[PDB]
């Protein structure tokens, strides 16, 4: 195909440089943008090697994966908050603004929950789609705020992941959601069953 991918992996966000990898259609046109976050043991590089950025690009989407503060090639950036608490919801807004992605579908697994959830619930921040993958901090957002989010959600998790069921109890409070349970998969379920993950993901993005 004619998929263009760049890793100018550098944008200034709240005074710090963050690394990012990107893949887009090539014509330069895309239905909308998809922002991918990562777990503490991974980074944007994991999405690249898994083929996700490329897959999404050839399907007509602009795919952008960043490295969160202190991880990956963003090692010298300082995290806005410590593991244990929510990061400012305005952090990802700055990210989106620097890359000029426009309202994006946010894929948020594990650790990134601390960044994505506060953003999903930020004032006036109505996203096109949200794809949580056993995020942390789901219990830090109260029912009232979850019920206020109208953005479509695809709750994905592996049935072998104890955080799957736990986080689901809170996430199910999202008004518009669908569940994608990956049988025989663990916490990083997208790595255990790539085909099932990519198929479910694309199917979801199509219905937006």
Active site residue: 73, 161, 167, 170, which one?
161
What are the residues whose beta carbons fall under 8 Å from the beta carbon of 104, sequence distance 6 or more? 32, 33, 34, 35, 64, 96, 127, 128
Would you call 159 a catalytic residue per the annotation? Answer: no
Catalytic annotation, pick one of 44, 110, 112, 167: 110
What sign does the dihedral 177-181-187-190 (CA atoms) show?
negative
Say if residues 107 and 197 touch (Cβ distance below 8 Å): no
- 203 catalytic? Reply is no
User: Is 187 among the catalytic positions?
Assistant: yes
Catalytic residue, chosen from 38, 170, 177, 187, is 187
Helix 113-120 and helix 90-99: axis angle, to 10°? 90
* Residues assigned a catalytic role: 110, 161, 187
């Amino acid at each position: 195909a004619a998929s263009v991918e760049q890793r100018e992996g550098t944008i200034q966000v709240q005074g710090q440089a963050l690394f990012f990898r990107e893949a887009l259609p090539g014509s330069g046109q895309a239905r909308f943008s998809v922002l991918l976050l990562h777990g503490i043991r991974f980074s944007s590089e994991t999405w690249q090697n898994l083929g996700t950025l490329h897959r999404l690009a050839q399907a007509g989407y602009r795919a952008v994966a960043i490295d969160l503060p202190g991880l990956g090639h963003s090692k010298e950036a300082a995290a806005p908050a410590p593991i244990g608490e929510l990061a400012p919801g305005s952090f990802l807004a700055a990210v989106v603004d620097a890359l000029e992605l426009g309202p994006p579908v946010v894929i948020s697994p594990s650790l990134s929950g601390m960044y994505s959830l506060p953003f999903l619930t930020a004032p006036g921040s109505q996203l096109p789609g949200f794809v949580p993958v056993a995020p942390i901090c789901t219990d830090k957002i109260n029912a009232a705020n979850y019920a206020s989010v109208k953005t479509p959600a695809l709750i994905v998790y592996g049935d072998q992941d104890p955080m799957g069921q736990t986080s689901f109890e809170h996430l199910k409070q999202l008004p518009n959601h669908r569940v994608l349970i990956m049988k025989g998969a663990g916490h990083p379920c997208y790595l255990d069953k790539p085909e099932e993950w990519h198929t479910g993901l694309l199917d979801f993005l199509q219905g937006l």
